[PDB]
Assembly symmetry: C3
Homo-oligomer: 599 residues x 3
């Protein structure tokens, strides 16, 4: 009786108060404590050594308490710990043990989920230091680490990095480092107010599977000149991806260093997301140095249905090698994306591009094996002043990329800087269904719309179609003499080209190759013989030995004669056709022709 | 001891019964009340003045109780209130204070989420009156309103509008009016059984951000002739959108007045949703009157991967101006959508269209600044009887829209009514990869497939490709004499056109323009000179002064001669070519030619 | 007093301990039991007849307990039962009553959700037997069954089928059979480790609506040679679909029998999912035998944005009939998908295909009514050795399918086996914007790239464009003499074709048809007359009576003469053109021409 009151007030009290669900006689006869034990919060571990609850706040380091919670729930086979709403929970010290090597704060454990409803903040203890807030590795050496399985972080809560700048460029900072992560995810969470390297990394060098980031927000996560590099979500295990997320940056430095996503393993995706204020959209890459878990091929890579305002490149393709491993990148789709380069001065940020074929980290452009890429049904726009804007900047070797039914409205279509790298290009396909916008009309003095600054081009198709005039451009397409061109199809539709002095330019007369198939407009001067009746007209110049046929693109203002409608050539390089002199006389005309070779 | 039993039975009783999670000695020593206080439901506020719980039902007005709950949780920094399953919670009176000006029932507050698992119903108090069920404004004047932040409504529950008709057309009704809403969302909820203006509105005149509607259902939300207008989700803040929702209407009135979504600010989206029984799919618009929060440009607008059966127009583009602000709409993508016009009589609902370039609310067609729109990889179908069906109805000024790789199977491709508006059109691009269906073959007597009823057309491309015969149509493309045409490309592929008497029709002979690039089939009568050997053939008519070349589309049934394969023209407007008379004689033939001008 | 202590320890004890939320004086004065009654778990029913809790495990059959829970919550109008984390809950017996006819384990009930956080496992009682784990029918006869409404299964938990093989091929096994299911869903759940027919079926013969599978995983669900057939999610009610799911199989048998999804009713979708190790991606079909609930038309079918590695066919289209009902399939979109055939020997699995137009279950190919299908912006790849790989295998009647802006890199573009079925084909549209890959170059000896093994082809378009050479192929396109061809457009672009001896082959000279529009390259020998000056050249062969024009694709190596640039024909089937002899003499040349008919 005295004993009873004592028991009731003790910590075992709830385990003595009976309960039966809804007074149902067929329900289990339980105690209150059993029902309360069905859920678990940080409050259940956020206490002093005497078991008195501690209130969180800027002067309380909640880390040991949250770790105690995770450790305990782990011991029972898992569950979900709530981080309660209405409170900010500060982290103020590093974790210990296997996450120490990763500058870990909290260690995640398998089957233990975190429902983050309140706020998690970093205390100024972390100012100018490295940190990785949640770490899923159990060993300082990732290679000796066990796995993290079935760990989900979700809720309406917030992870706030406290605004602290990096102390040194060589430091790393992360939000969620899942590790060798299988069936792990982050959903609904806002990551904000920092200077970090990544917010979330999934997998470790290809180890992991079925990891996803969904409906999260990432806001202002780069803030200093010290930050070396930033990729908001790093996907480094297969069968994993990012969808329906929001990414925003406002610092100037983010415009030069920040990427929203990097996809590094096969069967990965980046979809339905919105990006603003970033340098880059996504890197899609097989790095040989990360091929341990899932092989040396990145394939089945999808970037789709995203909205972006960026300052540099939207999708960056790459692959590289080590002494013992070669990376390969193939079977990629980039579709449905609507992307623009934000308002900025020309050359004030990394060169603007929808697609970039980038060299490796050390700058090499002769190691890449990138092929079977499909770029379709995207829109891209860059303001008229941004000289450094291209549909594709093709700066390293390329083994194939196909463009169909895009709308590109920027300065260049295909570009590479001259006197830089000399890529070897195979299987570049630019279908006639790509629409070329007019924003940059009149801005292109001295410039080639397709500036083919390559070592060589093979098995490629460029079908140029203009949709408005731009008489400022030097040419629609130009190949320098140093670029070999073979087994290719290069065509310039004549619409909007009547006043262009150059349409297609082959500085090494590469269009004469045996398996080169071309057509483009040119102006040609012809002279006829004096014969009345059917009469030959011949070109005054002799540079047409490669031409298989040509046809008139000009009206005939004359009554007394007509030039040929169509022409062939002669061994000396003249064109020759048969027109008609109603009355005799030598004729001399200047005609716009469509020159054709094997087409 | 007497005291103890008394305390235990009192409302402080649970705060005297000890608990320690799973009997863990390292866990907090708490009381039962602490653990129960981790969650909160409507039951905790749904009581009389003496604190006795009240059962909800049709004769209980739950509004003050739910408001008390929201107000209180707000006071503690937020949390989630559950609306319990297994009950219907009726609302029976208006709210008071700052939501009174919005005919508000409940006021939402920042960080207070609603987990709606049961049903929320409106009582007949609201019959024939305005209402807005949940309101996030805190002031009758939205301009003087504070913000709503971090408010999420979610669950498997239902909001039921009680079926009440509108009392008067000028009334407004809404479900969730979030207000100046930042990081607010609605997920999983069914909205049903009403006559409202909107179900959900996000933002206020551009104020707001990161607001989303996901996996909701909207069922039968228009039911009367009184309802002036309906848009189910109104997106009026940037970085916000609708995805994976279901929209259905069954009333006849919805076919004439209801739109599923309106996107009114930049960086907004409408994706992966299914629509049935609506007039319209989405309005995508910059209204100058709503440009306060986020600027006067709507850009980065995405409508993708939706399934719709509608009765009017799928996507409606617009922009307008006020005395001091001009709205602009650019950088839009419409892709992957599969849309049909439901079974209906011709002209029985608003004119059927995949894309509509609509005039402003007052009807003006000369204020719009719409450009950089990409319409790609969509399907559209309208039944054969629906005369009023078009890929695009282009009824107001247009500064650009690009169509690539769509499949359109309806009556018209491009349409505008004659004797209505006379749009000024720039940069309309209709790529040859648009496939034109055959459902309406034989229905097109008196009709032009592309009926270009415009003031002018510039920098436009129409590349017509048929995929089956339709000899009923008057022409594939017709320009009236009142339409100026310049710096454009207009082509009709010859497949399926051999028996057409008109292919392309330029009623003002606009194809003669200096920067007009055209080609289309025509039948031409020619006569030759009598000369044996190479011999000229000339057209009997003189209307070909604009033709730069022509070539045969007919076989030659003759042995003793052949007409020219190719033709040019003469100053008098004749065509002229060189054929061959094996035997002499004047020849007279009627040949199908491809007429070409600068192409 | 003695009484009080007794009451407190009894099962009514919690109903005597007072509580008021957060000590708020305006809150309801409740008892602890009321707050605990807001939630419900399996623990509340998992007890013996004396009400003592039973621990789950391999030797406890949890089925009756979970059924008791569902039944009870159903009685109160619904709610959500948690299946707790940290435990495995074994099922060990069949259910009773209306689910007995479906070999049901558990009966789902309306408004009763399951939050599965722990694991549900099948005990060896089910080895070699049929089962359907969760069943939503309430009657052994589905036709006499009531509906299941508002039933959601969700959580981070697992359903594990115990690895048991099927006992006999005629057995059926399912995970979730929702029945006549309205507003039902499964979200987040992993289904693994079995040999089943389906994991989830939605609807019953068209009865149902708004059923969805989202963010689930399906892993290793076929494991034996006994299994007759497998479709992981079967969508058999309208306004329903699958999105963001993961499907994986590892058994060899799955490569031959398993499909990820089947869509069987209108307004259904399959999006954003990843598939590996399956035979097939999706069946998209109207089966007449299932047209009871939602009509005999499957329309508004969407397969989009999926990633797949399969061994057979990606999307299979079909429709069939019964004695009284005819099924129709129309208005389908397949877009944005990136698909490959996995590494395998040629012919070692069902024939590889992006699209398959399949015969019915009994093998008939003359019952299908499939039209208005759009296949756009997809990628497909098959390794070079896989002879049995096609963009489309067209094996049954087809009333229309449109391909635009795909990238297909496999052995065939269009294929049907000769000496099999003889489909009747209408409205097959293959736009020039389809890019044909080069992986299979040099592998095509004896093969036609487009092998048109049909009864007939009408109102079809094939526009062949190569992007690299493949001189191994017999032809780019071949029609056998048995295939009628009319009102069609067939073109072969000349790029990469200069060395091909056959480009287009019409074994029945079908290109001569009145409404056939063709063009393709050919080599032609010509001889001229001896006349100096304008001089005719004529073909030595007479097989060109169908040719309307031809033009040179070869250079002229000669100085003293030129052949015609362009040719027409003569009644005897010769070609004839006018060239020029600078000096007289009979000329004899062999020229590559583009032959054109009505184009
Ligand atoms: Na490709
Ligand atoms: Na070179
Ligand atoms: Na555009
Ligand atoms: Na005019
Ligand atoms: Na179609
Ligand atoms: Na036949």
């Amino acid at each position: 009786p005295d004993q009873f009151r004592a028991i009731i007030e003790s910590p075992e009290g709830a385990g003595h108060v009976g309960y039966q669900y809804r007074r149902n006689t067929g329900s289990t006869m339980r105690m209150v404590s059993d029902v309360l034990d069905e859920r678990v919060s940080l409050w259940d571990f956020h206490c002093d050594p005497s078991g008195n609850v501690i209130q969180p706040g800027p002067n309380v380091d909640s880390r040991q308490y949250l770790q105690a919670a995770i450790d305990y729930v782990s011991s029972n086979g898992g569950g979900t710990i709530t981080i309660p709403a209405g409170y900010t929970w500060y982290l103020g010290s590093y974790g210990v043990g296997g996450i120490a090597g990763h500058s870990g704060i909290i260690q995640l454990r398998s089957n233990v989920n975190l429902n983050i409803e309140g706020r998690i903040h970093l205390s100024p203890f972390f100012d100018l230091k490295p940190f990785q807030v949640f770490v899923g590795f159990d060993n300082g050496d990732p290679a000796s680490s066990g796995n993290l399985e079935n760990c989900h972080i979700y809720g309406h809560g917030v992870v706030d990095f406290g605004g602290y700048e990096f102390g040194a460029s060589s430091q790393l900072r992360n939000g969620v480092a899942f590790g060798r992560s299988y069936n792990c995810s982050v959903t609904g969470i806002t990551f904000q107010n920092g200077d970090v390297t990544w917010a979330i990394t999934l997998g470790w060098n290809g180890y992991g599977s079925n990891c996803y980031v969904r409906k999260c927000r990432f806001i202002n996560l780069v803030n200093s000149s010290v930050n070396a590099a930033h990729s908001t979500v790093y996907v480094n295990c297969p069968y994993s991806g990012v969808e329906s997320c929001y990414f925003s940056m406002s610092s100037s430095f983010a415009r030069n260093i920040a990427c929203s996503v990097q996809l590094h393993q096969h069967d990965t995706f980046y979809r339905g997301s919105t990006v603003n204020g970033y340098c880059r959209g996504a890197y899609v890459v097989m790095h040989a140095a990360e091929a341990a878990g899932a092989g040396s091929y990145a394939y089945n890579m999808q970037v789709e249905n995203n909205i972006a305002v960026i300052y540099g490149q939207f999708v960056i393709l790459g692959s590289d090698v080590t002494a013992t491993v070669s990376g390969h990148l193939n079977d990629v789709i980039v579709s449905g994306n609507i992307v623009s380069i934000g308002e900025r001065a020309a050359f004030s940020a990394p060169f603007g591009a929808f697609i970039d074929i980038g060299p490796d980290n050390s700058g090499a452009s002769n190691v890449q094996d990138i092929q079977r890429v499909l770029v379709t049904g995207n829109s891209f726009y860059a303001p008229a002043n941004i000289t450094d804007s291209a549909a594709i900047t093709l700066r390293a070797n390329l083994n194939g990329c196909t463009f169909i039914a895009n709308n590109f409205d920027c300065r260049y279509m295909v570009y590479n800087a001259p006197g830089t790298t000399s890529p070897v290009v195979q299987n570049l396909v630019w279908d006639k269904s790509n629409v070329i916008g007019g924003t940059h009309a009149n801005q292109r003095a001295g410039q080639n719309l397709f500036d083919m600054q390559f070592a060589s081009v093979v098995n490629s198709t460029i079908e140029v179609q203009l949709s408005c005039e731009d008489l400022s451009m030097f040419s629609c397409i130009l190949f320098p003499a140093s670029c070999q061109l073979s087994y290719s199809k290069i065509t310039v539709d004549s619409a909007w080209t009547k006043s262009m002095s150059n349409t297609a330019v082959f500085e090494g007369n590469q269009q004469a190759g045996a398996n080169v198939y071309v057509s483009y407009p040119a102006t040609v001067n012809l002279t006829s013989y004096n014969t009345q009746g059917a009469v030959p007209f011949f070109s005054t110049d002799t540079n047409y030995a490669w031409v298989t046929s040509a046809y008139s693109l000009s009206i005939n203002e004359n009554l007394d004669f007509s030039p040929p409608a169509t022409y062939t050539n002669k061994a000396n390089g003249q064109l020759v056709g048969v027109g008609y002199n109603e009355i005799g006389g030598v004729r001399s005309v200047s005609v716009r022709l469509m020159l054709q070779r094997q087409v």
